[PDB]
Ligand binder design. Structure first.
Ligand SMILES: N#Cc1cccc(S(=O)(=O)NC2CC2)c1
Ligand SMILES: [Cl-]
Ligand code: NA
Length: 371
């Protein structure tokens, strides 16, 4: 089980695709909800995501069918299409997924943020970094629900530097585009969701605290945070969860005026990556770094909750640390950081000590030596 949020708000979830094309925005929305008696949200909602995962693993497509058998009925505890909780303006997080992931695999984070009064837009990237994603070729296809699928692109070593940079820039553009869509819906623009879902987008009108925007992401999504900040000053701070820094161009490092928080796992990181993070530092800039003790790269994503303890540790989905404990730390520390740099008037400053890595399961800064 993916944990419920630790906050006071019930959580809703829905999907938005606008426009319907491969250049449109696709996101999964997590939001504070009015009601708590809805069906839970299907975690991986189409068979094609499993085929995507199987290609990402480098196995036959029939491993995909087996994955679907194992995980295809699994839910996450958000009230599917529940009405938005009215009467309050919510700050906004745009969330970016990692390589081979897609929009639905960070519900533990999105749910928990939502439970504390954030609206969270988990984008699905169309850069071929997702295991799978979909869209519609034209208006006819969207009407009848004739999905076209786009699968993970595998790269030759000769393509890595160039194509990973092209992708992170596209990812950044997709984050900015997703922000603009949400802000336009906030400002009342009719938007016909290309997915025929019983969640009226007009609910979001006047529901966003329009200056309180952050960008968060994991792995490739952590590089995406940084690229995004460098090109869209509407994002007021960023949180990079175990960032994979390789995609970033040399130019971005000096170009991030906003506060930025690195939350790392103990076992993922390596000197080349850490050196790149430290290139983001300068005395005028607000930078924080913590490392979760006994954690692995997958502690930030939902598959850390999908299998047992034993098989979890074998597959590197789990680390030495308990998964709920690790994500509570990442999420609470994130909450404190967001409150500080978005100027929120909540109680998230109770976790200020976690930003400085003051906790028995935190290492201040990094365990990685870079000499
Ligand atoms: N859950 C989950 C999940 C599924 C697929 C890929 C990811 S990743 O961490 O973005 N990709 C990194 C490992 C290379 C996470
Ligand atoms: Cl329902
Ligand atoms: Na921009």
């Amino acid at each position: 089980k993916i944990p419920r949020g630790n906050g006071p708000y019930s959580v809703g979830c829905t999907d938005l695709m606008f426009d319907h094309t491969n250049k449109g925005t696709f996101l999964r929305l997590y939001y504070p909800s009015q009601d708590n008696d809805r069906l839970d949200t299907l975690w991986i909602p189409n068979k094609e995501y499993f085929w995507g995962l199987s290609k990402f693993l480098g196995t036959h497509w029939l491993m995909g069918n087996i994955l679907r058998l194992l995980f295809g009925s699994m839910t996450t505890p958000a009230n599917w299409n529940s009405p938005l909780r009215p009467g309050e303006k919510y700050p906004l997080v745009v969330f970016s997924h990692g390589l081979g992931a897609f929009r639905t695999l960070y519900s533990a984070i999105g749910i928990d943020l939502a439970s504390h009064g954030f609206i969270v837009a988990a984008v699905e990237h169309r850069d071929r970094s997702a295991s799978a994603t979909y869209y519609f070729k034209d208006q006819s296809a969207a009407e009848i629900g004739d999905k076209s699928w786009l699968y993970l692109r595998t790269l030759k070593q000769e393509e890595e530097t160039h194509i990973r940079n092209e992708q992170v820039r596209q990812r950044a553009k997709e984050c900015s585009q997703a922000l603009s869509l949400i802000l336009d819906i906030d400002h009342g623009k009719p938007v016909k969701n290309a997915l025929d879902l019983k969640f009226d987008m007009e609910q979001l009108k006047d529901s966003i605290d329009r200056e309180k925007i952050a960008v968060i992401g994991h792995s490739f999504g952590g590089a995406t945070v940084i690229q995004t900040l460098s090109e869209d000053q509407r994002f007021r701070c960023g949180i990079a969860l175990d960032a994979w820094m390789f995609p970033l161009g040399d130019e971005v490092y000096s170009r991030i005026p906003q506060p930025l928080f690195f939350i790392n796992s103990e076992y993922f990181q390596y000197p080349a990556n850490i050196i790149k993070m430290k290139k983001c530092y300068s005395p005028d800039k607000e930078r924080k770094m913590i490392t979760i003790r006994g954690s692995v790269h997958q502690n930030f994503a939902d598959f850390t909750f999908a299998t047992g303890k034993i098989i979890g540790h074998m597959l590197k989905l789990k680390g030495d640390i308990d998964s709920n404990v690790a994500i509570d730390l990442s999420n609470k520390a994130s909450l404190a950081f967001l409150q500080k740099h978005l100027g929120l008037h909540k109680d998230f400053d109770q976790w200020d000590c976690l930003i400085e890595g003051d906790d028995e399961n935190l290492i201040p800064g990094t365990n990685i030596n870079t000499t």
